[PDB]
Amino acid sequence: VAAERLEPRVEEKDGYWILKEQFRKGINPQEKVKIEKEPMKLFMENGIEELAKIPIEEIDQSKLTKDDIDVRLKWLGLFHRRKNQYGRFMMRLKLPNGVTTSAQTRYLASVIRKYGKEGCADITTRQNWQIRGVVLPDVPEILKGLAEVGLTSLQSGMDNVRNPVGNPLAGIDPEEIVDTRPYTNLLSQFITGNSRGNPAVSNLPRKWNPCVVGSHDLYEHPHINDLAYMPATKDGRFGFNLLVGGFFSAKRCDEAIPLDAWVPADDVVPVCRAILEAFRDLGFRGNRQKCRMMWLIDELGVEGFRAEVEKRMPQQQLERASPEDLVQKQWERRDYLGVHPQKQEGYSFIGLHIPVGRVQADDMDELARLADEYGSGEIRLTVEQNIIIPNIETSKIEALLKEPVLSTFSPDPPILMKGLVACTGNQFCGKAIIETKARSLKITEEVQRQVSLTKPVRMHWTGCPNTCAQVQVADIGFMGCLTRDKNGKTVEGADVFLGGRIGSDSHLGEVYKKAVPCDDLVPLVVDLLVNNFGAVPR
Ligand code: SRM
Ligand code: SF4
Ligand SMILES: [Cl-]
Numbered sequence: 001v002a003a004e005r006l007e008p009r010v011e012e013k014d015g016y017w018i019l020k021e022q023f024r025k026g027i028n029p030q031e032k033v034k035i036e037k038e039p040m041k042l043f044m045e046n047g048i049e050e051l052a053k054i055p056i057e058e059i060d061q062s063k064l065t066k067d068d069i070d071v072r073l074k075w076l077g078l079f080h081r082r083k084n085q086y087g088r089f090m091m092r093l094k095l096p097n098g099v100t101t102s103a104q105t106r107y108l109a110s111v112i113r114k115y116g117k118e119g120c121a122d123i124t125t126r127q128n129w130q131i132r133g134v135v136l137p138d139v140p141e142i143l144k145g146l147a148e149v150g151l152t153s154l155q156s157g158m159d160n161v162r163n164p165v166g167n168p169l170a171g172i173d174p175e176e177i178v179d180t181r182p183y184t185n186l187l188s189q190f191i192t193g194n195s196r197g198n199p200a201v202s203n204l205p206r207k208w209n210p211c212v213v214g215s216h217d218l219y220e221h222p223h224i225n226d227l228a229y230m231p232a233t234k235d236g237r238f239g240f241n242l243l244v245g246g247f248f249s250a251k252r253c254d255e256a257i258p259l260d261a262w263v264p265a266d267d268v269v270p271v272c273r274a275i276l277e278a279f280r281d282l283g284f285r286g287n288r289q290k291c292r293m294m295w296l297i298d299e300l301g302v303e304g305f306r307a308e309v310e311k312r313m314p315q316q317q318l319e320r321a322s323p324e325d326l327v328q329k330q331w332e333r334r335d336y337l338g339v340h341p342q343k344q345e346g347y348s349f350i351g352l353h354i355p356v357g358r359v360q361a362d363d364m365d366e367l368a369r370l371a372d373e374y375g376s377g378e379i380r381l382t383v384e385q386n387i388i389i390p391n392i393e394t395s396k397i398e399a400l401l402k403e404p405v406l407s408t409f410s411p412d413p414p415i416l417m418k419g420l421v422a423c424t425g426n427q428f429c430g431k432a433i434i435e436t437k438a439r440s441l442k443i444t445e446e447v448q449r450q451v452s453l454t455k456p457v458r459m460h461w462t463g464c465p466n467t468c469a470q471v472q473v474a475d476i477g478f479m480g481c482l483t484r485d486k487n488g489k490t491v492e493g494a495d496v497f498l499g500g501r502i503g504s505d506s507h508l509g510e511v512y513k514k515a516v517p518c519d520d521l522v523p524l525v526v527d528l529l530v531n532n533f534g535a536v537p538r
């Protein structure tokens, strides 16, 4: 690779970072949008105030403002549901480590409550909140209300650093390696400029996923993140080995690979900045399917990429990876659903199943009430779109288990429901080929009626090849497709994936059977469970 390839392609201009004029040839349309107007101005120069006052019908009549609502608003966490819910916006937060409060939960519920049938909320596969039904005129007030309860929505979509994922058992688990909350909190604060906005990292070639590991279980899925911090001692010091470039896409899925780098714990933010700077500065900005960070690593090679990170470290040192990390390979992923003792004596946490991550405002108020009456006001989200309420005096558990709402959000659902994960699908997502959430519930219920099992089989349903519900990590994955019934009529289908493994011995699953009509999935899945996962016909 030439020395010329290493020339930074972006420059700071008026507090923002923009593509240098020599590197603007052949860029994709999204890069054009970013050049035409810096998205961060909608927040940092309060451009949202004036945009929000324009009727949508009129917004749609010019390119600049249509690009504002359909693309630039994703820098403010706002996603126009143009096809399936015209004029309404899904809104996505930053929620490092999945940690929320009862007050935050009540505030979000109060927002969606206003929108009635157009509102609801969802836990995401990055242990994050999404809310729905938002109208543009309400945006200025919602942004103020979020700030008031200590939330931000900044930089949560498009070409930005996504929600920092950590250990859902951080601080409470007797077996944790290192509490991940301080580090995911620092990362989020760094990425969003302490909720003011951070333009140094808001103009990447593409989305970029971080996680910090603190569990032997690897609840954080480090193998599928752009940057994963793996806890490791080096020369007597606590820190992290770094894995880089994991990603899923319609074209390619790849697991993260060692950068061959270790940082002390205090260097978590400096190396996150160095890697993002290298990615921002040097990454390809053509075909969107070749813009993820792994593609840069493949072009430069891991050593060439590593050198770029190294020059962007303070004092310009990057130590080599330590031989062995702290994650024990001898480990069985623990079920966190149900009631479990904390490391603080006399306290328990409870894991509650949220069916396919979907909640309404009344449900959110109930969960917030439980967290206040039984816990410490804290609610934790998980990447299986479930919840944990920590910090419950164990003497209160008898009473808690009698709460009516626990019959809906159960601490002990059937085993197949425990592991069930589903993306938004075509109820709201315009890219979706099929309906996912209702369908996956109905199918899973009918399957579980027919078989009993002991192994915790994880089933993931995703509505299109973007694979937001990560079908490549599942024991059985279902990817939306259109197919044909026996009479040649169009019907919703799934491509069925097998082979996905998580934890230290991770593996990416692959298509096993294409184009299965959804209405035929029950018998197929019953047989797979009996033949491959030890299930027993009832
Ligand atoms: C909500 C969520 C799925 C869920 O039900 O849980 C989601 C939903 C969306 N994803 Fe995703 N993705 C979500 C996690 C994922 C993950 C899983 C992960 O992060 O571990 C992946 C695969 C992992 C990865 O990216 O490496 C992912 C892969 C993407 C892709 C393909 C990325 C690529 O490189 O090609 C897109 C399309 C794109 O960015 O070009 C997509 C884009 C979309 C959009 C924004 C599509 C569009 O705008 O309509 C979806 C919004 C639908 C809606 O209204 O909810 N989403 N998305 C997740 C929100 C996570 C969060 O809180 O930040
Ligand atoms: S996998 Fe496809 S259908 Fe599901 S939320 Fe992602 S983009 Fe939408
Ligand atoms: Cl996006």
Ligand SMILES: [Cl-]
Pocket: 080, 081, 082, 083, 084, 429, 430, 431
């Ligand atoms: Cl859409």
Ligand SMILES: [K+]
Pocket: 353, 354, 355, 356, 357, 384, 385, 386, 420, 421
């Ligand atoms: K769930």
